[PDB]
Design a protein around this ligand. Sequence first.
Ligand SMILES: NC(=O)c1ccc[n+]([C@@H]2O[C@H](COP(=O)([O-])OP(=O)(O)OC[C@H]3O[C@@H](n4cnc5c(N)ncnc54)[C@H](OP(=O)(O)O)[C@@H]3O)[C@@H](O)[C@H]2O)c1
Ligand SMILES: Nc1nc(=O)c2nc(CNc3ccc(C(=O)N[C@@H](CCC(=O)O)C(=O)O)cc3)cnc2[nH]1
Ligand SMILES: [Mn+2]
Length: 159
Amino acid sequence: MISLIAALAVDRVIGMENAMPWNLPADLAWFKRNTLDKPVIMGRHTWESIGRPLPGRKNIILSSQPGTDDRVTWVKSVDEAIAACGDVPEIMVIGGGRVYEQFLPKAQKLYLTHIDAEVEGDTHFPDYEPDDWESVFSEFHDADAQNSHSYCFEILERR
Ligand SMILES: NC(=O)c1ccc[n+]([C@@H]2O[C@H](COP(=O)([O-])OP(=O)(O)OC[C@H]3O[C@@H](n4cnc5c(N)ncnc54)[C@H](OP(=O)(O)O)[C@@H]3O)[C@@H](O)[C@H]2O)c1
Ligand SMILES: Nc1nc(=O)c2nc(CNc3ccc(C(=O)N[C@@H](CCC(=O)O)C(=O)O)cc3)cnc2[nH]1
Ligand SMILES: [Mn+2]
């Protein structure tokens, strides 16, 4: 099945100038935990902000342009990206904006982190139809010494 994983601040903001303004060590631990040993699909911009292959996962990048690093897999369309994953139980789509928009309809599960932070950005998470989704897991956390804002980890399943 296909799942989307993402961190959103106020207003569904997900990035600004090809980067994520905040720093939340706990959220990144959660991201790694949920994606390790699974294939991750990302768009070219995202590949670029990340700057290197994510270890322990098959990294698949979507680009209309030919590949430029053999350490990852390059695909030119959504169907090929999905076929490149092979037979696995869960495929993780990691963004960015344009790529989330294209996979949303095909996704059965969303792993969202809501962050209490007001950031002015240029990329947003798609505006999905709440009706259609069921929250099956929620876990709130106040801010602390290592994490600058409070956040909520949530998992939705398409009804
Ligand atoms: N907070 C989060 O959880 C989170 C997660 C991911 C990203 N982000 C952020 O989001 C921004 C990057 O998002 P973005 O929307 O600018 O770009 P993106 O979605 O990472 O990348 C867009 C690109 O990927 C390729 N692509 C997408 N769909 C394709 C398709 N169907 N066939 C072929 N190529 C396709 C195209 O590359 P070519 O131009 O080479 O065709 C397109 O320009 C950043 O600020 C990043 O920091 C945030
Ligand atoms: N919940 C969530 N938070 C994010 O920050 C996020 N970021 C992306 C894309 N950007 C990035 C940027 C850096 C790393 C990264 O450095 N990850 C390391 C974690 C380090 C640790 O495990 O403590 C990794 O191995 O996953 C991942 C995605 C996609 N979905 C997200 N989803
Ligand atoms: Mn159902």
